[model samples]
Each structure stands twice: as structure tokens, then as C-alpha cells.
Target: KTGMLLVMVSNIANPFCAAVVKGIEKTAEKNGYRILLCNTESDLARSRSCLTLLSGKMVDGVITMDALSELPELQNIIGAFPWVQCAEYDPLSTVSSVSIDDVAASEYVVDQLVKSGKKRIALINHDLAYQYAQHRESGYLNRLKFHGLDYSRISYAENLDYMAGKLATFSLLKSAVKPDAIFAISDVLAAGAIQALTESGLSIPQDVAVVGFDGVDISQITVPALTTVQQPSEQIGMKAVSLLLEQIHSDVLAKTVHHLLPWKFVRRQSSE
Candidate 1:
């Protein structure tokens, strides 16, 4: 009951956010504070309501992962509030951000697949509307252009669920240009892709090599283990809380900050 901090995420069910929560709790409890987590589901109105609710609640500051940072409505709802963004960031705003460079991460992901002699690389991505989505797609296309491998068949999954990933993979497989390698945007999606590939009588790495992003715990448990990019989810959470505390302490004196953490490319059996 000392100090309570607010942590908002697009979805609490996501392992990515779950990892982030671990960091937030670590930092908060270490500093003698408690946490209140809110799942906005990326709904614009619900996000606004949460912000309004924080106004009267016992909240000190907020750490949010939302997609509306670039909206014209951003300033109106969260302008004077003490908040830091994690994962999803807005390039045009004065908000503090803690995340990896999405484009470079995806570029390296595709390069590993290409370097491994996997041709006809397909990209299974979430919707192209989110800024990170655009960044990842650009990175994938950039490397594809560099390799002169134009066999780019992309399937868009609106969500990160296993079924979405599998359906997207199946759709990409049925396309005219078959892919020997697939780069799923999320590990969950990759897991789904692996199932789809196996069910279609395709052997992992032999018939089709697969690469995935977001090195969540699920990646390690998958059949062949996933070769993927690992983001500092827990560290990001702790850092976000730290940054917000700085703002809370300094108030008007604290300058806006954008922190870019390094990401790792892990090669496993799936992409071998």
C-alpha cells in the first residue's frame, strides 16, 4: 500500500507481455511498491478510459504498450501524465520509449534464413497497420531485395494466436510460389507454422526451414526448437518502470528519453 504503479499492455495473455510483467513486478517490488496491470486489448476507447481512471486512482505513473501513440488523440489523453512506452513506440512523440529497433531485428531474422541456403522465403506477419508491423515488413523486403530473391509471398494474421499463425502459414503454402523457408513474425505464429508444415507432410529444415521472432518460452519447447530473435522483454519492463520513476521524481526537469536495447539472433534446429 506504499506506492502503486500502473502497467498497461495490449494483451495480458501474450507471453511477450507476461515477460514484461515479470520485470515490472521485479522493479516495483524492489522499490517498495505494488502494481496494477490493465489489458487494453488495443481498443482506443478502453485505453482512454484507463487513462481517465488513473487520474483519480492511487497511481504514481504508468507503463503502457499501446498502438495509439501516433494518433492525434494521443496528446489529449496522456499529455501531462507520467508514462513510458514499451515494445510499441511512437517516433513522432515526446514519450519515453524502451524497445529494440524492429526493422533491424527482422532484417537479421531474414538474413539468417537466406544465409542458411533457404530460398523462396515467405513472411508470416501480423497486420500491416501497426508501426512495428510496417518496420518488420520493410526489413524483410530490404534483405529480400539485397538477395535478389523476389519470391516474397506474405500472409497477414490479424492476431498472434496459434490458429492465426497456422492459417496464415497454410495460406502462404497454397500460394503459387511455394516457400522453402518461412519467417513468422512471432514465435507463437512460428509454432503454428511448424504444425501446419508438419501436417502437410513437410519435414522441418529438410523440406522447409522455419524462422521465428520474439524468443518466448514456447520457442524452446517446439518440436525442432525455433531459430529466432530474442527481445529483452523482462529487462524492458524493468527499464520502463525505472524511466517512469525518474519522470515522477524529476517532474518538469526530466527530459524525454528513447532507449534502444540490443536483440539476439538465436539459431536452432528449425532454421538449420
Candidate 2:
């Protein structure tokens, strides 16, 4: 009854998430509601704890940006309030969500990297538990195979941060035949990869080209701005809030919805 919406975000440090939250806040305030941000830190237990706000009726609805919908514990509180998934969501669940098509975006990125004539490409991706990661990886693998290219050069980071990306790139750099190009799933990881490649004495876009997803602010400030896929972060947030609010006003038996948004390919100096 507080007319509050709980936004469950996995990482508060990500510029992409911050942008999405900005959109959500703007829309929520326009409709006479306040938002409470809960940083779940991408943990199952923490996400569940945040759900208590909804179950206890502290908030009227929820806008989640995490992949916790399939958990058995989550099923216990299903439909307690209007909820919509933003950015990250579970493919198997029936909850409404708003996101770009990760598979197509990844394919486009690979196409661009190949267009630059980089033959030996590598993938730097985050944990596969996230649907976006899995879809992006699948797109990468599928596109590489389409080009008749070797798809064995792949690494996974435990988290989505610069250090994790750097460590993963370090591991890839040890290869007997180093990758000529790296396509990281996120800009943060790509920025780390850039630093690692630099420390290894490799010249960017000459010895090794770099590409990243999520055209967040970090992508622009990297040594050479990243070639990236730009998600409509603010629009994504706005759309999720609209869908969630719709659910809030609808009957309990309303059908789940899914909103597939558009993403753009941004070419910068890093992939030249």
C-alpha cells in the first residue's frame, strides 16, 4: 500500500545498470511512486532476501534486473505482486521482461569484427548462468562457425568487472598462439582485456583488436573507445516500468508479457 516499487539489481557498479535505473526512477516518479533499490550482488540468497519487501507488502510491485526467476524458493512467493524483469531474466519463466536480443546482437558484433579482417578471434564472457551470457556466447559460436573460423578460443570470468576481465584476458594471452581479436560480452570485461593486452606489449587493432558489449560510459573512456553493442538502457527501464505498472493495475490472472527491445552497434577506435 506504500505505492513503492522495489528494483532488484545485481550490480550497482555497472554503468549500464545505473542508466537503466535512471530511466526507471524517472518513469516511477512521474507516476507518483518512489523506488527502493536493492543490490542483490547477483547472489541467490540476497535476491531472495530482497523479495521479502514484496511478500511483506512493503512495496506495491517489483522491477527485477536479475536471473532468479527459476529458483524453487522464488516460486513460493510467485504472483504476490506485480513484477517485471529488466535487462536480465530467466528464459524458462513466464514473467514479463524487457531486453534486447542478445543472440542477434552478438552475431552482429562478430560480423563487424570479421569485417575488420581479424581472423583469430577470441571470446571473453561472464558466467553462463546468465541468459544474456549464454545467448551472446551462442551467437558468437554460431557466427564463427558460419564464417568457418576456429571457435575454440573462449574464456569465462566469474564476475562482470574490470579485474575479472583482466584475469581472464591474462589467461588467454598465455596461449601458444594468441588471439588476434577479443570479443568480450561486456564493456567492463573488454576494458580489462584492453589493459591486459597493453601490459603484454600488444598494440590494439594492430596486434589485437578488441570489442565489447553494452555501450556504457566505460566503453567510451577506455584507452581506445570500444566497438560495442548499445542496449537501450533507459528505454529498457522505462518499458519495464510501464509493463510492471500495467500488471499492477490488471487483474491477478493477467498473462505474462515479454518486450523485445532494439540494440544498436557502435563502432569506435578499439575495433579499427
Candidate 3:
């Protein structure tokens, strides 16, 4: 009898997800488990179809990196099978999850900026609909409040990509109350912000300090060498496999646990 595991991912093109899949594949191979990679390309409809296909085949287990846009449909699927969420959405009462402390990570980034004398800080985040992005936004706000800063100084962006960052920065540059620093939720957005700033003849750190999350490889090679919060992505993959195996061999529910991994701040020229 061969034990098979189906891994459904949001976007295979995303390097972050690719690193996670790499970790999961290595661990699965060492443990005598067969791994199937499924890419939804960040589409909820395709993800739903993939899940349906996997459930019909009765795979031993399933892991996902994206959130289900349709809650009711996802709930029905989880109610019927053993599933794990890797990064986004806390399946607190339903399934096991391996992720980082997004709230605390954002708070730490904001706190660091406040301590470094950045008072007028703007936030460039993805849409607040995503759970992870919401947590990060709240974390940034709460830390700013704790430090006796006014929340009115903050700015928001619609999308969570390079172009959004650039547009948001452009808008900020035109405003009378320009932000002294920015905290982009992702490194990709930070890269875009850097471009916008340079095009406007603004020097980083000296004129405006910037920080970002997700310590992707591009962070190291960006113009100013981005400073970001590093999430334990590979460890999450390893632990997710271990958790799934435990659930497979056990009679209990594996407690439907939630794991919030640690995050580290990597200082660089962008933040000075």
C-alpha cells in the first residue's frame, strides 16, 4: 500500500510558494510518501476543482497555501476530509495549520521604525480582505497607537503588488503630509516603492526609510538591499508534513491545531 499526499498551492509562479513546495517534497521523499503537486494559480475556482478531484480520489492527505474564497464550500470539504492550511487563513476550529505570527511580525516592524524615530509612517498593503493582510494592518496600527502616534498619518493601498506600491507612493508624494517612512507588507511592493521614490529623486533612508515583509531573494539584490521580516516558510513545510503523518496514523483528530512560527527582522540599507 502506497501512502500518497496531494499538495495544492495557490501560485507555483510565486517563489515563496515554490520554496515551501521544495521543502515539503524533500521531507515527503525521505519518509516514503508520494507527493502530488497541484497548482491553482491563485484562483479560487480552480482550487475548488482541484480539491474536488483530490477528494474523489481519496488521497491520504491534502495541504494548501491559499485561502478559500468560498467559505461554505471550503467548510464542507474540510468537514469531510483531513486537510491542512500552510500559510494563509487560520483554520482554528477545523484543520491543522503551519504559519507565522503575522500580527506580531508586523508589530515588530512598526515598533522598530518607531524606535528609529520614524513618526509619519505609511502602510502599503494588499486589500484588507485577506486575513493575513488584515492582521498585519491591525498590528501596525496598534503599535503606532501604543507609541502615542496619530493613526491619521497612515495611508492604504488597494492591491498587494509592485504596481500598487508605486501608485500609492506617487499619491503620497503629491500629498501635503508626506510620510517619512513606509512599511510595505511584502518585498515585491517594497521594490516598487523604491522605484517610485528614486524616480521622484528621493534618497532612501536619508529621505524616507522603508521596510517590508517576506524576505525573498530579491530583497538581497534590490537597489538599496531591502530590509524585511523573514517568515519560517521551509520549517512550516516540514512541520506540516509531520503533522499530517501524525494525523494519518492516529485515531484522534490531531487536535486541529494552529502553529504560529517565529519571524525575524533583517536590517539593511533600505531601513538604515
Candidate 4:
């Protein structure tokens, strides 16, 4: 008998995506489904092409982590087929999804930073054009507003990887509003920021604190172990597949469904 085909889509080749893929592969094997993995290489057009290729009758469902595409293109694809959006993709009106509450997760981490007596914090974020980036910025700023602190202390950068972290941290150090702490959206970025800060004669949690998201393994191995928010990434993949499978097996419903998974804030030397 032919089994269901599951297509997993990713925006970039990173450890985060690798973790999610691991979960999807594991679940598919256990459930006797065939899996096809696709990488968009962070290109919106490539993502669209991947979608088009995977939407054939051979594919029973798709799970995507690419959220950088135009809304109409995504809607057109999902409108014609069954799909699952992973991580922070927000086309919830058209497809089922499984992701962490990005806004609330950032808020929770920022609140922890404030509670640790750090003020004048700087943010290391991705390009503002992305919805996930915007949500993270909102999370940080709203938390500051809720605490009666000025939001002007926040700063952002375009690139979101290690080199970007180094550059952003260097710029923040040279700025007039010297931050007492920094919150990077990824463990790789936070590690790079810590490297820059250390080389610039600053000490983690003594001169400046740092926190990061994505709870990657490197976070703990760094000089000052990083504080971070751990998303249930594998569970996100599994649940997304489950949702997509359910949609595939059921009758068409009236509306789409959304699922937001939980996250945990892990404390470490950087943000203690």
C-alpha cells in the first residue's frame, strides 16, 4: 500500500531547522509515512517553487518553516492544498500551525532581565520586514512599557547570525545609550555578542548581561552560560505533522486552526 507523503520545508540551513526536521523524521517513521525535505535557502521565490513541487497528489501534506514569503502566495498554495506552518509563520487563516508564542516568549525573557536588575537593554533582532522579527520587537517593547520603562533603549540590526551579533554589539557599545544588558533572538547571535563584549573589556553579568532565545546547545558551553527561552522545537515538528495529517484524513472544515506551543526560560550566568 502507498503511504502518505510528508514534505518538510525550511527557510535556511540552521541547527534550529535541523532539530525540527529530526522530530518530523522520527514521527513520520513511527507512523509509516514517506518524508521529503526541502530547503528554501531563505529565498521567497525558492520557497514558492518548493511549495509548487510538493503540492502534487503524491504529497499528502506539507510543514513549512519559511515565513518570509508574500501572504497571497502562501494563501494561494494553502488554499489549494493542506499544509502546516511551523515556528512563527502567521498564515493561520489558511493552514494549520504549531509554533511557540514568540511575543509572549520574548516578554517573559525581558521580564526576567528586568527582574535581574538590568536596565537599558539592547535588542539584537532580524530585519524588521519579517513578521517574526516584528513580533519579537513588540514583545520586548511592550514588556518595557508594562514596566514603565522607556522603549527607546531598544536597537536592531539586519543580519541575525554570529557576525551580525558581533557588529551589533560593537555598535551598541559605541552608542550614547550604553546598554546594561543585551537580548539576542538566537543562541548563535548571543554567543557572538558575548565574544564581542568580552573582547571589548566587558564582563558578562558584571558589566553587561546577555540573554538569548532558541536554547541551542552552544548556549551552555559558552564562557558565561547564556540565559535563554527553550522552544519545544521537536514537539512543534511532531505536532505540526499531526495537525497536517489530521487535516489530510478529515473532511474539509469551515476555518483554519492555529496551535501555539509553550516555551521555558532557562537561567544561566549571563542573565542571573
The candidate that wins on lDDT is 2
lDDT per residue as tens, model 2, 1-272: 34889998868987888999999998998887899998875687887788888878778888877764344446577564687888765566677888998888998888888888988889998877667888888898889999998745889988889999899999988878889899999899999999999999999989999999888999999998898899999999998888888887755565777788889999888987
| Tens digits of lDDT, candidate 1, 200-250 | 999999889988887999999999999889999899999998888888775
Ranking of models by TM-score = 1, 2, 4, 3
Q: Estimate each model's TM-score.
A: 0.94, 0.93, 0.89, 0.89
Inter-residue clash pairs, candidate 2: none
Q: Is candidate 2 or candidate 4 better by lDDT?
A: 2
Assess candidate 3 and give its lDDT.
0.78
**How far out, in Å, is residue 121 in model 1?**
0.7
Per-residue accuracy of model 3 over 6-45 as CA lDDT, tens digit each: 8887667556787788778777777788788788655667
Collision pairs in model 3: none
lDDT of 4 by residue, 1-272 (tens): 44565454544445778778878877877777867776764466776676655566566667777664554566767574667777765754466677888888888878888888877878888656556778888888888888887644554655657777888889888876688899987887898889999999998888999998888787888889998988887898888777776776666552477888888998899978
Question: In model 1, what is the error at residue 258, expressed in angstroms?
Answer: 0.7
- Order the candidates by lDDT, highest first — what do you get? 2, 1, 3, 4
lDDT values, one for every candidate:
0.84, 0.84, 0.78, 0.76
Cα-based lDDT at residue 65, candidate 4: 76
- For TM-score, the strongest prediction is 1
